[PDB]
């Protein structure tokens, strides 16, 4: 559109449980604070998932 | 000393004259302008800048 300069910008919300989702809100099932908020971080190991 | 006085038999005694003068005026020309580009109007944040 006119009168908005020469640049266009767009957001992106992919990281729902991917590795790129980096945050400090995590709390594990026991109730303690943990480093990563995402549950798995795109790991296919059965041990980590369990 | 300079009064106009006649006599009993007076002719060609007190002559006077007159004078006129002139005034004048003239006219002149003034002006100024400004320039702009299409991009300046289209991409500026403020519409109605003109």
The secondary structure of B1-50 as a DSSP string is -------SS--S-------------------------HHHHHS-SSTT--
Q: Count CA atoms within 13 Å of residue B36 on its CB side.
A: 9
Q: How far B32 CA sits from the closest chain A CA (Å)?
A: 28
Phi, psi of A27 (to 5 degrees): -140, 125
Cited resolution, angstroms: 3.4
Q: Which residues of A touch B42 (CB under 8 A)?
A: 2-3
Q: After which residues is chain A broken (C to N over 2.5 A)?
A: none
> Which stretches of chain A sit within 8 Å of chain B by CB?
2-6
Residues A15 and A25: their CA atoms lie apart, in Å, by 14
């Amino acid at each position: 559109p006119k009168h908005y300069g020469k640049t266009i910008k767009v957001y992106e919300y992919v990281p729902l449980l991917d590795d790129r989702n980096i945050n400090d809100q995590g709390i594990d099932a026991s109730g303690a604070t943990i480093v990563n908020g995402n549950l798995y971080g795109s790991s296919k190991d059965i041990g980590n998932i369990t | 000393s300079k009064l106009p006085l006649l006599t009993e038999n007076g002719g060609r005694v007190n002559r006077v004259g007159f004078t006129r003068i002139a005034r004048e005026g003239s006219i002149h020309k003034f002006g100024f302008f400004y320039e702009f580009t299409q991009e300046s109007i289209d991409f500026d944040s403020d519409d109605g800048l003109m």
